[PDB]
Design a protein around this ligand. Structure first.
Ligand SMILES: [Cu+2]
Ligand SMILES: [Cu+2]
Ligand SMILES: [Cu+2]
Ligand SMILES: [Cu+2]
Length: 466
């Protein structure tokens, strides 16, 4: 029998209006071998912090690691001062407090470290948690809502381990070029778990929490997934798909049918990204087993979910151009190291100082020099180009949920046309329509970056003020 799917605790404020998060080192077991891991309020991963539109909460963050860290709320429209980018340092043994004044629609967001040059390692060690934002609108819908029963978070991540069982993380020329990736897949920290779901509808809140691996969800028997929400909240209507690509840092909420007595798997299908279709990910790979059970459920798939506003008019919008680049030497040397490791048949396309080698507008990230000041309270058009580069860059902008106008050469797919905080850039150009409602000064700037973490950590990031 498979281990049961772990369910993160749904964490709400105490009588002081406070939530306590302790960042700490402990131990986990994978494949019978123990490993040192890091977690929020535990050994690995983290709880699901529950927030309500229009209400404030205060979060007390205790760093019990022996190195500096920061805590970023990915997807939250909050001021730079509480955004927890690389300037939001928490000393070892210290505590920092932030007040979050939640003012955006219902969504599944998440949180993770953003330490300067070390974001990849700190996420690889185990640090990530969830954010469940609710509002009046969503609770009136007849969606599955029993946490841990028919409304289930699914945080999917790969790791690699050394022979002794420890997490094997390195920022080297190979991983700086293609990313940190591994041969072991985790689902809420467990290897191929099973979840017991009531007959009817099952709601999955999917997060790609990998450092560098893109994913593509589907089911083992080809039943459809009904997408109801993206990074920034509900779609206007459900969107039926047979497969669902999810980039690093993205979330989607789906409904799937659960019937009778026969179990089926959620799987991830092979992707085209360099390194990622190497065995065991050259075939459909199980994520988790879904076992039907005969207990109470009343969730439904509504005809209509939300209202989606018109895209803003393009006339007179400020245009900002962001050119992504990688040093051609890093591309050469990294790809060479990949073929040296795995050989020339490992996947398709293989047989025919790196610390500041990745850049935006010809500059590796400078924490002391924000690239520009964006306007407050008005839409801008940002144009992000990966032309001249063949790698995949899921481009993430802090402090906002935006609308995708063009994604890598075409209008976005229907389930990607709502509220997003990430856009695909892969050898072509993308355009987003973006608005910042909150301030970010030089001392606590917003970041914009590729969310392939090893690219971020080796320079593919800029700061901006509002
Ligand atoms: Cu993030
Ligand atoms: Cu973010
Ligand atoms: Cu990148
Ligand atoms: Cu970031």
């Amino acid at each position: 029998e498979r281990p049961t799917l772990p369910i993160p605790d749904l964490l709400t404020t105490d009588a002081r209006n406070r939530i306590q998060l302790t960042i700490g080192a402990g131990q986990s077991t994978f494949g019978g071998k123990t490993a040192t891991t890091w977690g929020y309020n535990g050994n690995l991963l983290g709880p699901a912090v529950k927030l309500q539109r229009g209400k404030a909460v205060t979060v007390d963050i205790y760093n019990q690691l022996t190195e500096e860290t920061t805590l970023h709320w990915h997807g939250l429209e909050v001021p730079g001062e509480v955004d927890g980018g690389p300037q939001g340092i928490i000393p070892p043994g210290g505590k920092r407090s932030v007040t979050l004044n939640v003012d955006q629609p219902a969504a599944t967001c998440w949180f993770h470290p953003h330490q300067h040059g070390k974001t990849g390692r700190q996420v690889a060690m185990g640090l990530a948690g969830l954010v469940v934002i609710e509002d009046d609108e969503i609770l009136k819908l007849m969606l599955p809502k029993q946490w841990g029963i028919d409304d289930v978070p699914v945080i999917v991540q790969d790791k690699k381990f050394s022979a002794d069982g420890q997490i094997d993380y390195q920022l080297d020329v190979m991983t700086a070029a293609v990313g940190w990736f591994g041969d072991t897949l985790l689902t809420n920290g467990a290897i191929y778990p099973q979840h017991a779901a009531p007959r009817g509808w099952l709601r999955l809140r999917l997060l790609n929490g990998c450092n560098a691996r893109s994913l593509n969800f589907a089911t083992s028997d080809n039943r459809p997934l009904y997408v109801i929400a993206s990074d920034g909240g509900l779609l206007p209507e459900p969107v039926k798909v047979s497969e669902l690509p999810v980039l690093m840092g993205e979330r989607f909420e789906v409904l799937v049918e659960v019937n009778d007595n026969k179990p089926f798997d959620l799987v991830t299908l092979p992707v085209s990204q360099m390194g990622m279709a190497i065995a065991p990910f050259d075939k459909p790979h199980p994520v988790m087993r879904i076992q039907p059970i005969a207990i109470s459920a009343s969730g439904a798939l509504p005809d209509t979910l939300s209202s989606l506003p018109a895209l803003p008019s393009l006339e007179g919008l400020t245009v900002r151009k962001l050119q992504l680049s990688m040093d051609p030497m890093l591309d050469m040397m990294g790809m060479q190291m990949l073929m040296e490791k795995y050989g020339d048949q490992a996947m398709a396309g293989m047989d025919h100082d790196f610390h500041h080698a990745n850049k935006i507008n010809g500059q590796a990230f400078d924490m002391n020099k924000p690239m520009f000041a964006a306007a407050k309270g008005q839409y801008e058009r940002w144009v992000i180009s990966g032309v001249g580069d063949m790698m995949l860059h899921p481009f993430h902008i802090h402090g906002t949920q935006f609308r995708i106008l063009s994604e890598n050469g075409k209008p976005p797919a229907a389930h990607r046309a709502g509220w997003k905080d990430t856009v695909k850039v892969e050898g072509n150009v993308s355009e987003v329509l973006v608005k910042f409602n909150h301030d970010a000064p030089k001392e606590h700037a917003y970041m914009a970056h590729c969310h392939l973490l090893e690219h971020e950590d080796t320079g593919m990031m800029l700061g901006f003020t509002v």
